[PDB]
Amino acid sequence: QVQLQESGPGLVRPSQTLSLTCTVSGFSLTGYGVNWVRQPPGRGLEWIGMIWGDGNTDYNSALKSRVTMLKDTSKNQFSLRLSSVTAADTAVYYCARERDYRLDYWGQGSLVTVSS
């Protein structure tokens, strides 16, 4: 079939650097984009950015200052790294496949709660 899957630290201590894996598998890592959207609870969906099958990436100007997306060609997975995380970043992270101007396949994100 076709699937992605956030995994990772459910809780992060503020000032730190949060990070998640998105393990895809059912499509190719190069002819497909992996988009990353988060959504602080009660608040709606927001577009973090997106990494391409070539490693290049497009950030969302609020998070450019601290987000970072990688890809592990060798393991069907993509990495997202937020930094100097604060309570304003506690939310559910989603990785999804953008295929033809649509994000057809989403993981069922993993919640991350920052706090001391």
Binding site: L45, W47, D58, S61, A96, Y101, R102, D104, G109
Partner: protein, 108 residues
């Protein structure tokens, strides 16, 4: 980059009711708008992409219109299995922004 302005933020409708939520991108996003139905708890699901098209599997009770700048999304008869938030997000260009989200709620 196109900001998206979707509304209303929250509508109450009894079942059977028709429902239409609209997104108006700030700058023609050229039909490159997709609608998502998100039910409390799960990840967003793709109902419609490219304004007009229903993602395979999506029933014919949802539809979307618009061109250039002002697009729309519509549920023809609200069924209980449709009570959820819906967000649109253009793709005309990065950053792929999202609507504020419409909260569809059974009128109590």
């Amino acid at each position: 980059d196109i900001q998206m302005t979707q509304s209303p933020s929250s509508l109450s409708a009894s079942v059977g009711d028709r429902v239409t939520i609209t997104c108006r991108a700030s700058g023609n996003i050229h039909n490159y708008l997709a609608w998502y139905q998100q039910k409390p708890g799960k990840a967003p699901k793709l109902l419609i992409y490219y304004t007009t098209t229903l993602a395979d599997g999506v029933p014919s009770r949802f539809s979307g219109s618009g061109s250039g700048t002002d697009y729309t999304f519509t549920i023809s008869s609200l069924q209980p299995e449709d009570i959820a938030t819906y967000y649109c997000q253009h793709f005309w260009s990065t950053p792929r922004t999202f609507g504020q989200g419409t909260k569809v709620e059974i009128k109590r």
